[PDB]
Design a protein around this ligand. Sequence first.
Ligand SMILES: CC(C)(C)OC(=O)N1CC[C@]2(C(=O)Nc3ccccc32)[C@H]1c1cccc(-c2ccc(CO)c(S(C)(=O)=O)c2)c1
Ligand SMILES: CC(C)(C)OC(=O)N1CC[C@]2(C(=O)Nc3ccccc32)[C@H]1c1cccc(-c2ccc(CO)c(S(C)(=O)=O)c2)c1
Lengths: 249, 225
Amino acid sequence: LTAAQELMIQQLVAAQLQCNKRSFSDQPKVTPWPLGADPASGSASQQRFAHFTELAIISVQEIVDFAKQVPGFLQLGREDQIALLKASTIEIMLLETARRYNHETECITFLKDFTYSKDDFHRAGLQVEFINPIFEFSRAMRRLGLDDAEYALLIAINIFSADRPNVQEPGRVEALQQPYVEALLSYTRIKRPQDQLRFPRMLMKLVSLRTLSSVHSEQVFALRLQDKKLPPLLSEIWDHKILHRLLQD
Amino acid sequence: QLTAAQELMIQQLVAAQLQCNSQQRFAHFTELAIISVQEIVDFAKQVPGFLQLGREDQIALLKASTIEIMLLETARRYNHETECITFLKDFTYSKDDFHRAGLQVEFINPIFEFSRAMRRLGLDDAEYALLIAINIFSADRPNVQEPGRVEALQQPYVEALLSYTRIKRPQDQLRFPRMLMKLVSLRTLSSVHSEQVFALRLQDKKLPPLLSEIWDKILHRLLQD
Ligand SMILES: CC(C)(C)OC(=O)N1CC[C@]2(C(=O)Nc3ccccc32)[C@H]1c1cccc(-c2ccc(CO)c(S(C)(=O)=O)c2)c1
Ligand SMILES: CC(C)(C)OC(=O)N1CC[C@]2(C(=O)Nc3ccccc32)[C@H]1c1cccc(-c2ccc(CO)c(S(C)(=O)=O)c2)c1
């Protein structure tokens, strides 16, 4: 790997790293998880759902703030910036969700120490048909055994997709992606020269994430139909004045 | 370098593909679409390892893959000098001639976008045949009976394609990633096609039971014969 890449990966891992620290700043701020309440309680399930949406908000903010730190993103037009973000934010979140999965306990730890099992997502009114794919995806990512550099590069590759809808300049975004693919290819050859198929398997997770983006759109439509109210930011992304405000700041 | 077993398997796949190879024009396209599905399932049965899986697994992988291979096969037949797509021997159609048959314009142009994108990649018969086999053996499909087996069935083709592209185009080290990114594209084009097929339904253009079944039985009979 060339020296300009080595600095870039260090820049990307640091930006990811700086974002992980920020939320913890926000952990006390969240709505509390209901304790001592009935699992079947419709009242309690709504508070559990409200808890997760606020966590989901903090994650969207992290991804937006990370996207501004990755080189070449802010050089694009704001209409393109959000167009890349709408499509990617959910996929970036499932990567981050997979990153926070523990196979020993089978629990996903959000923020500093907010741990939840497969049942806890079910008790927030989320269907198991939508929950189980996220856990299957989370197990598949642990088998690859990705590190901070490989995640961060895979995140940037995922952001710069010309394949997204409503992208005005696909050539420029594909040109912007190529260096991140170069860096990731060259980085995977130094780390595991023995395993040549390690890098292809990473790029096929981006294939998985597109189906996972689509099932999430099916879920969100069902949750709005089931009277589970999303915050304005999250509903704006998955239906963009609010989203301009983060990027402009 | 490729082994003689790997080289023989590639030429097995290329040989397998070559063996299978308004209202009036609409009936034509659906009649053409069935032939492609029949070519896909027949080709799928030529692929080594596809028939050692359970029918529940076989159908799950086909059902998801048929469009994605149809779109890959559509891209091959596109000619950029004319901007026309050539089906079978002598059936050539422009984007307007697709539009005149009642196919919606919002869905047509992404397919044409994909066809030009595939043209720029400049895939050959071998690379195409490997990419179709890689697409068939995808573990992220709905209704997985056994996802661990299909990942193992995919590996030989991904290894073959990786080693092939490094030999065929050693200068272009990123040739192999781009063609994997087209599988990422083909997933959104898959979910897009579901949205299209639905739109024709309400225009009083219901798909025939084979295409209705796949893009919602008859698929067992095609796999059986
Ligand atoms: C629909 C609402 C808005 C409630 O939720 C979401 O859109 N998602 C996306 C994925 C998500 C889901 O749908 N099922 C699920 C099962 C397990 C793990 C995550 C999820 C959920 C979620 C639920 C709880 C937490 C997160 C979350 C995802 C990523 C990150 C990492 O940045 C963080 S956090 C707060 O720790 O930053 C939180 C996501
Ligand atoms: C809705 C019905 C069921 C009628 O159509 C389809 O689902 N498809 C899938 C792809 C398709 C589409 O949706 N828009 C479109 C625009 C241009 C080119 C192909 C298409 C179309 C099609 C239309 C006409 C021909 C084909 C076709 C696609 C592939 C092959 C070869 O594999 C052959 S053929 C007959 O030459 O074997 C025909 C596909």
